[PDB]
Amino acid sequence: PIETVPVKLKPGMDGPKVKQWPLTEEKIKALVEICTEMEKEGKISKIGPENPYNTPVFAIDSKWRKLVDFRELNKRTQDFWEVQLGIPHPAGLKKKKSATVLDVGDAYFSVPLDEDFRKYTAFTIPSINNETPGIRYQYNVLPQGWKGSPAIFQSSMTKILEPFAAQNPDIVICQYMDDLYVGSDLEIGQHRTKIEELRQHLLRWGLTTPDKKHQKEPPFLWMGYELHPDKWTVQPIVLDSWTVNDIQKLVGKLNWASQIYPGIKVRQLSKLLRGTKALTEVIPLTEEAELELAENREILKEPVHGVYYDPSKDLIAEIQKQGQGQWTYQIYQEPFKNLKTGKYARMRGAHTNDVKQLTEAVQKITTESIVIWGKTPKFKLPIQKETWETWWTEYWQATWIPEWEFVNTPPLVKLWYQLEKEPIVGAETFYVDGAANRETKLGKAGYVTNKGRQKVVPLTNTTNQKTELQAIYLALQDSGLEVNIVTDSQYALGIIQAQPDKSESELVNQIIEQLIKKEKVYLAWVPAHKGIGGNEQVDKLVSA
């Protein structure tokens, strides 16, 4: 009785036409038996040779089911509105007095197929002997392996549910694939009463559900979770094997555990998986990564459970700086009962700031909260309000953080150095510069100072930008606690101005370490080759 969804093929393409591969006669009789039963129930109907289209059929106790390869038909079938890939996260669920799983049987076969599209779903039963022409059929309902069957089933289920949902606004119905998860806070008696009403309502539309064979409430082993009536957790995770693929599956299991297990670290192991591409290839076990596996095994020994969600209470997210470039966070409402946990790693890039990384993690957690709970959390962050205010006011970019409160949990996020906004009086003025020959990959760096100091160092395997940064480093090393540096390198000025906390460049890190020891540093920029006095002198010294 369900209304059909009009379906069309892609404009350029046309219906499939494939040849059926031969098969064993025992399978052929089995396919014959299966197709005769389906024909009786209206699911499939025999066709003549007027139809030109065919797609290959196959057969696979404990078994002998029918499989059809619709890949060609799928390639020719229009795109649909895709079903939702994201699965409900258990931490987003609200505790309910009772909750029931009503899985739908033969779900696709209950829903009709567009009459004009049925022709393309045509299949030919293999003939037992090559001499006879095989029997031919066409689907009248949604084929199992077809592109539009998942989406058309979902829309049909939504239509069937909409009236009953309005009649019973108290009941909460969740749709995921063929399963319908129903929760409520009625008394146990009225819950079963409405569950039975829902079962009857689906039956009028030809959808069948378990009755008193419903899955048991404690062992909700759903999509890798345990859904207890009072809590949720990750299903038990196992894990020594050193193949590349074995490492990848280990890292996946650790990430999946990190939803609720705090402190799971994967940074060292992720460095092991660096485009090797050889799943069989064994990897050397760095002691840094090998210890990392040991730490996780200690954590995984502790059984961890998460709580469900309470709309009346506030969402709190708290973030801890773990290591370098790694951040860990917990989201909770009650003081020690966590809704879930997670990690955020430094996004790819060099010259990063701990303050900048913290903001991005706040950004990531904020978006995650909206997906799961529909509101944004209150944050507990390991940064002083004085540090953040200094950073935002002087930062070149527009930044914002929601309401937050300092937590004195070290390590604390701090600005390791701050540059001077005005030239320092009584401080030596270093005019630095660098240059290198691109073909030779060789160059030089140095400085010329107001007091007459000068220096040039020879360099090898360097680029022009590296020399420009190197000259700044040379001045920093050969300077007192207060120094004024004048450069023409926009590249150099930009890195230093961004106040990077660290980087992958050992030179930049050295510059950072020199900058932190300095009491005051002022960096000024001047146009190159414009006749500025100090810059002109150093340019001849470095490049010649």
Next chain:
Amino acid sequence: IETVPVKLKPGMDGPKVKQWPLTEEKIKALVEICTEMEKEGKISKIGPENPYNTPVFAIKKKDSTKWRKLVDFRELNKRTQDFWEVQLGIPHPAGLKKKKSVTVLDVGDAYFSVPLDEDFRKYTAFTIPSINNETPGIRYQYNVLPQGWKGSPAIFQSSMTKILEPFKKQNPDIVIYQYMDDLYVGSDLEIGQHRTKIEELRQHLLRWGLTTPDYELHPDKWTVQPIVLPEKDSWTVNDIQKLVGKLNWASQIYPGIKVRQLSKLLRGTKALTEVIPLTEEAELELAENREILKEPVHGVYYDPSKDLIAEIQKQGQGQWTYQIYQEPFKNLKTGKYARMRTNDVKQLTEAVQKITTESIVIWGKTPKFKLPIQKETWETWWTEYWQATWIPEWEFVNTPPLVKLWYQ
């Protein structure tokens, strides 16, 4: 009513844009708004054979309790409106900028009476999202002219001209321009007379069936931010170095700038804090450049076939500077906004809407902004402070303008 046939540009498929996650309050508002719209026939629910989708958001729009639906038709417009810009385009009045006062009215409710071509409605598909993927999203398509779609004002243009003809005849001195969903009404009258005329126009539309919701721009006061060199009694080496850098920069915008005599001051390896007397030749060189910078820039013309580009820089203390250009150093306009004192994002959002409004009034076109903010930050919170019925195109610059601001 008959429906104008509408076609996407050839070799184009309808928009397939991901719905950004929403808050529970915004989802609840959107379901309430769309429930009523479906009853009135403006929209209706759609099946899974419609693969297209366009984002939907909810803005307060300065209404204390009223929630407004905003559809982000930027992708559909790019695939539709350019064809509609030529065939059914709308002219732009060069005098709206000259007018003393311009008021902006929302005429979006007008479009809902005119129907849309049945072969085009599928491209107007949007999805009301769901929390934690607990339910499939509610899916609708428009049966009438959508509010954010640039084809809607083009189709209604005939009906708008008929409705406004009586008022325009009685008030020939008032300029009326229609950018998508909005009516820009410009007068040179006193504000109280202008305000009374505006209410008269609102009543006129209401009598003819166009409901108007229940700001005041002053384009004559608008002036560009001119380049201004510092004026000092004593100059440090740092001062002269910065002056050389700023003058060197302005050479790209202003031909005629000289830094020869001023650079000669900087001969030698002197300390930054050292005061330098200015040679009379350099004093002349600095004075000459000031006059060159004092003169308004000349020789930049708006090319309608090109995009406009808006760059924004975060100055301190709530100030923002911006430049609108089509060519890298040929600026059609530059300005500076000061905040009343507010989140940086709220300030940036306000800046973007102010610039777009000015760009609409001046050129009848919206610029593509280069926003100095992280993408995820902007995507999460731009809707919070957004009051406009349109959405400009934007991109994100994560590279700091390490080059000194030199925009004040």
